[PDB]
Ligand binder design. Sequence first.
Ligand SMILES: O=C(Cc1cccc(Cl)c1)Nc1cncc2ccncc12
Ligand SMILES: O=C(Cc1cccc(Cl)c1)Nc1cncc2ccncc12
Lengths: 304, 304
Amino acid sequence: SGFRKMAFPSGKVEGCMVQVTCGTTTLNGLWLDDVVYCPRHVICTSEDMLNPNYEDLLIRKSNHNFLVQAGNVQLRVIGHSMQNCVLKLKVDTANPKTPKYKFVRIQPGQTFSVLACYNGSPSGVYQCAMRPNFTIKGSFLNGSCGSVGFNIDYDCVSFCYMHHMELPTGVHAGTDLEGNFYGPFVDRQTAQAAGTDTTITVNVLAWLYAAVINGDRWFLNRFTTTLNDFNLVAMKYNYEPLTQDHVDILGPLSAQTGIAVLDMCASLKELLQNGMNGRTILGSALLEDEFTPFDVVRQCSGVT
Amino acid sequence: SGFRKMAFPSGKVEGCMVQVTCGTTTLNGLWLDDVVYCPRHVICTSEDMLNPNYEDLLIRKSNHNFLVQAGNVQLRVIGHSMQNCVLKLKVDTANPKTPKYKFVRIQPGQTFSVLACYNGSPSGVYQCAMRPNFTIKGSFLNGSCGSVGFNIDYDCVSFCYMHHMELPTGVHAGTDLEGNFYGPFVDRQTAQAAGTDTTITVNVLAWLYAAVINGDRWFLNRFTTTLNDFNLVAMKYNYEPLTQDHVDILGPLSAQTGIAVLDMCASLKELLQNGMNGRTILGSALLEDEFTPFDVVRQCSGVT
Ligand SMILES: O=C(Cc1cccc(Cl)c1)Nc1cncc2ccncc12
Ligand SMILES: O=C(Cc1cccc(Cl)c1)Nc1cncc2ccncc12
């Protein structure tokens, strides 16, 4: 029993982290096969970060201007190219520690582990979610750019995120491993609107199933609801609307506990209308939305 | 900015995990140099777990009865011995992936990362604290025994915990890497008293400094207090008493924010007497005690 904000073991990603220096700027890079992926703002100085013409700034750069260091040893850059907001540095050596991997673009509401890095060295690992407004609520300091988000299926690491920017609101924006920012964000030093951030309803429901599984059952009530009635309540409280796809993914958890999905929605509705009344659920005093139904199943089953 | 329940990168521990089978029981082992450490209840069947005479049960075991598998390859056991509640299996090969390491016994209130494992394979990593009643609030399923808790200083892994048991209350009990259980717990299938669990006052104060550092400052007030006055409030609310050693360790955070330690105690006092009033602090609706003052400094500085 017990429920934790658990991250994937970070070892397979640790062996891919390198440090990339260009001019006076140093950030993290991701070494896979013979290619190092890093954010393209590595070619920038604070002066041109106000409105950078990346194509023009890259024209002044050569393969020898990109310094790629793996641990303590230097990699030789034999090629460079820009793909959207990331730079791809071809190196002359394939990373001996490249794991099985995929580059995936996650949907909002999905979760992932982040391996925070400074100077190509890892500092820590944590679990987080892609918010409905396409920001991540991370923990990142200057020099954390290039840190990646990922998921792991058995032996295959699915890279989903690469950190780029911190908004004035202390929230984080970044790209998939093809260089496309999640959301409206651009890699510029301008104030950018994050957008309204809703609560991920399917994840709070999944977390509520995990609470029942691990002993916390005070919030269970004698009521049921319909998808349309529940969605009226979700609208008022800035929760994402629940659809039949959401109910379908909550099938395994509904089957494990024997609480119908709509019966659990009625518990959610009453917790939203009445609050927790000073009580807790899995050691939290608020409704947690950063565990997907897959995460709860995996944590309560023990997938390695 | 941002504050996360961050764990150490788990790679150095991943390369030490093995699977140990003895009879019909399989649990995790920790392979360091030529020795595999695992919980001694590996020699037990559910029948003798009611009151096992471990010395007598080990007499019926030989080096060939302990099956140690590293990934997919078998290790040859050339020696075995019992040290307190752990078994030390000498193997004929030194783990090529043994990192720099120490075996340390942590104090209650201190935190550590856990690499949860099933069948010698890692499932996830999470941050947790040794509770004042010597239990850990983990997330563990059957077969997680042998999973280790650790800290990392630059390149040296300090192993502090090895998981053994889950109490009827869903809380976890375990040992240091010398086989000594933290707390009164024995490795038997009997109901055991966890004890009163207080809140780690120095850690909530450190977390409150982290909140100020990362923008959350609503809880700051126009008051101060004394150590004796604050301790009266801590007593009422089951918080550990604050001592001058606690105030000394909160020096760096007091110096970083400019809020005197006793001034921050006065904020803690008012949050304890008045609650959060529906507000949050670092995305939490309760006072978090699982970040030490060292953890806050490291997270807000970027130690790798
Ligand atoms: O914000 C930036 C640099 C940047 C500025 C403008 C556009 C881009 Cl694409 C990148 N990176 C950082 C990441 N995470 C956290 C931070 C904390 C402190 N300072 C900087 C941080
Ligand atoms: O409780 C036990 C076995 C045990 C029984 C009595 C004494 C000892 Cl030293 C060990 N180990 C488990 C660890 N963590 C979580 C669990 C979850 C489910 N089943 C079992 C768990």
